[PDB]
Design an enzyme around this catalytic site. Structure first.
Site, mmCIF file in Angstrom:
data_model
loop_
_atom_site.group_PDB
_atom_site.id
_atom_site.type_symbol
_atom_site.label_atom_id
_atom_site.label_comp_id
_atom_site.label_asym_id
_atom_site.label_seq_id
_atom_site.Cartn_x
_atom_site.Cartn_y
_atom_site.Cartn_z
ATOM 1 N N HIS A 22 0.799 -1.192 0.000
ATOM 2 C CA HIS A 22 0.000 0.000 0.000
ATOM 3 C C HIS A 22 0.832 1.242 0.000
ATOM 4 O O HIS A 22 1.855 1.326 0.724
ATOM 5 C CB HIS A 22 -0.935 -0.031 1.215
ATOM 6 C CG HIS A 22 -1.946 1.037 1.188
ATOM 7 N ND1 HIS A 22 -1.569 2.388 1.191
ATOM 8 C CD2 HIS A 22 -3.292 0.903 1.058
ATOM 9 C CE1 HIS A 22 -2.684 3.050 1.059
ATOM 10 N NE2 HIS A 22 -3.721 2.190 0.958
ATOM 11 N N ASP A 42 -8.511 -7.074 1.545
ATOM 12 C CA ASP A 42 -8.884 -7.759 0.343
ATOM 13 C C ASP A 42 -8.169 -9.075 0.255
ATOM 14 O O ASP A 42 -8.616 -9.984 -0.443
ATOM 15 C CB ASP A 42 -8.568 -6.765 -0.801
ATOM 16 C CG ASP A 42 -9.780 -5.910 -1.170
ATOM 17 O OD1 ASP A 42 -9.812 -5.316 -2.287
ATOM 18 O OD2 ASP A 42 -10.801 -5.860 -0.190
ATOM 19 N N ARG A 84 -20.139 -0.328 2.344
ATOM 20 C CA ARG A 84 -19.777 1.052 1.910
ATOM 21 C C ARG A 84 -20.950 2.124 2.039
ATOM 22 O O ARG A 84 -20.791 3.377 1.953
ATOM 23 C CB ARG A 84 -19.399 1.013 0.415
ATOM 24 C CG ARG A 84 -18.683 2.225 -0.150
ATOM 25 C CD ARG A 84 -17.577 2.823 0.775
ATOM 26 N NE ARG A 84 -16.691 1.830 1.400
ATOM 27 C CZ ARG A 84 -15.478 1.572 0.983
ATOM 28 N NH1 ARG A 84 -15.015 2.166 -0.062
ATOM 29 N NH2 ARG A 84 -14.740 0.643 1.609
ATOM 30 N N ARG A 118 -17.912 20.866 -9.219
ATOM 31 C CA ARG A 118 -17.720 21.576 -10.515
ATOM 32 C C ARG A 118 -16.340 22.182 -10.792
ATOM 33 O O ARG A 118 -15.989 23.302 -10.548
ATOM 34 C CB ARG A 118 -18.996 22.268 -11.082
ATOM 35 C CG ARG A 118 -18.865 23.000 -12.393
ATOM 36 C CD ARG A 118 -20.039 23.994 -12.544
ATOM 37 N NE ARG A 118 -19.735 25.456 -12.314
ATOM 38 C CZ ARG A 118 -19.809 26.181 -11.151
ATOM 39 N NH1 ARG A 118 -20.173 25.644 -9.941
ATOM 40 N NH2 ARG A 118 -19.518 27.523 -11.184
#
EC number: 2.3.3.1
Length: 429
Positions: free
Chosen positions: A316, A371, A397, A417
């Site tokens: 990681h 995982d 989640r 935006r």
């Protein structure tokens, strides 16, 4: 009986939280956070601060944090099933609050979801006639979009509620969603893999995790417990990941919670977002037939790293010790499934891998994640229907993409935006 207000609490906290952010942007507001590069535009806004997601932060020293509360401190704190392993409830509580729900604050919510837990007949219908050929992550996404019919917020949108009133109903959609997620997902399965039989009832006496498993139609008591710890941990993990980012972006457009969570899943449905748990498990599987040694696997992995390959699961970017969410599930097999041929294995990787990696310069955080640890547990209990693992990870989640959705609304954050690029432009720019 007993209870705490949740909404009631929420309602109190806010003006507190809305004041701290206004002082803040009011002073240091235009203070210079970072620079944008012509490379980071082309890199997926790679390392580009732009969030203000408030439920969780990655700590390079402790893993993820549900306030400051790290994987381990939640474990011993968040209120237990009455088992060992924590309730996604207290967790969802925490996340929305900044607090540790007490006994009756958690049970408060179980009765709450028990209730909220009603699925229209039009979504039932539609789920039912879905062709098996349609992926579960596909049917899920469609249900939730179809459930959006039921949205208190759309409706109070129509009717003309006011700004400040935005949260008080994005919350209402909020709880119902979570409430009827295990029905949608219990239904998917059963329909897919349990020869489309019934999902059953809803017991108010039961806490979220259990009615899921019992709707899921699994009975192993150990089974439920894993249910309880798996929903907690896959919960949240910053606001920059596909799933969250996407609830956020679509949600910004004042799109009822439902609408922003069925897009959030089109996102999780991604390959570079949905299949990791799965990848590994497949590689392990291959390991599987390719009891043996420190010596042979050290040799195979060696060869793996050397043969230009990589080990699905370790390494990681920031993380700087064991994802505790891996530890969490390992702390479990031992409890549980301790002499499990495939667990064993998993656990070997643990012994072998970090060293090899470090030694074969592909380091600085060689420790595995979550995982690497789940898939071996899911399957152990019976959960071999792998395409489906992505729903479980979407049911979890949930708790952390909603429990901020209500705050983006609450703080009153605007339309995402970001002025867009163009390669001919930048070339001149």
């Amino acid at each position: 009986a007993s209870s705490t207000n949740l909404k009631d609490v929420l309602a109190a906290l806010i003006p507190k939280e809305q004041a701290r952010i206004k002082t803040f942007r009011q002073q240091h507001g235009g203070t210079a956070l970072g620079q944008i590069t012509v490379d980071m535009s082309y890199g997926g806004m790679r390392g580009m601060k732009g969030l203000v997601y408030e439920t969780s932060v990655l700590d390079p020293d402790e893993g993820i944090r549900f306030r400051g509360f790290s994987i381990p401190e939640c474990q011993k704190l968040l209120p237990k099933g009455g088992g060992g392993e924590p309730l996604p409830e207290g967790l969802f509580w925490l996340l929305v609050t900044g607090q540790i729900p007490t006994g009756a604050q958690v049970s408060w919510l179980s009765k709450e979801w028990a209730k909220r837990a009603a699925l229209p007949s039009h979504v039932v219908t539609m789920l039912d006639n879905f062709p098996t050929n349609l992926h579960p992550m596909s049917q899920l996404s469609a249900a939730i979009t179809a459930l959006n019919s039921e949205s208190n917020f759309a409706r109070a949108y129509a009717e003309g509620i006011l700004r400040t009133k935005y949260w008080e109903m994005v919350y209402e959609s909020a709880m119902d969603l979570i409430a009827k997620l295990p029905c949608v997902a219990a239904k998917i399965y059963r329909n897919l893999y349990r020869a489309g039989s019934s999902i059953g009832a809803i017991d108010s006496k039961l806490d979220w995790s259990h009615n899921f498993t019992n709707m899921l139609g699994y009975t192993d008591a150990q089974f439920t417990e894993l249910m309880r710890l798996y929903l907690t941990i896959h919960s949240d993990h910053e606001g920059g990941n596909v799933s969250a980012h996407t609830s956020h972006l679509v949600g910004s457009a004042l799109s009822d919670p439902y609408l922003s969570f069925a897009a959030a899943m089109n996102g999780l449905a991604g390959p570079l977002h949905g299949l990791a748990n799965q990848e590994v498990l497949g590689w392990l599987a291959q390991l599987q037939k390719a009891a043996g040694a420190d010596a042979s696997l050290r040799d195979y992995i060696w060869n793996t790293l050397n043969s230009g390959r990589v080990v699905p699961g370790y390494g990681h970017a920031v993380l700087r010790k064991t994802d505790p969410r891996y530890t969490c599930q390992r702390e479990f097999a031992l409890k549980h499934l301790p002499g499990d041929p495939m667990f064993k294995l998993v656990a070997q990787l643990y012994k072998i891998v970090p060293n090899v990696l470090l030694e074969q310069g592909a380091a600085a955080n060689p420790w595995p994640n979550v995982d690497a640890h789940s898939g071996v547990l899911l399957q152990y209990y019976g959960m071999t229907e792998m395409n489906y693992y992505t729903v479980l990870f979407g049911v979890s989640r949930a708790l952390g993409v909603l429990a901020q959705l209500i705050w983006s609304r609450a703080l009153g954050f605007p339309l995402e935006r970001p002025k867009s690029m163009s390669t001919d432009g930048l070339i001149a720019l």
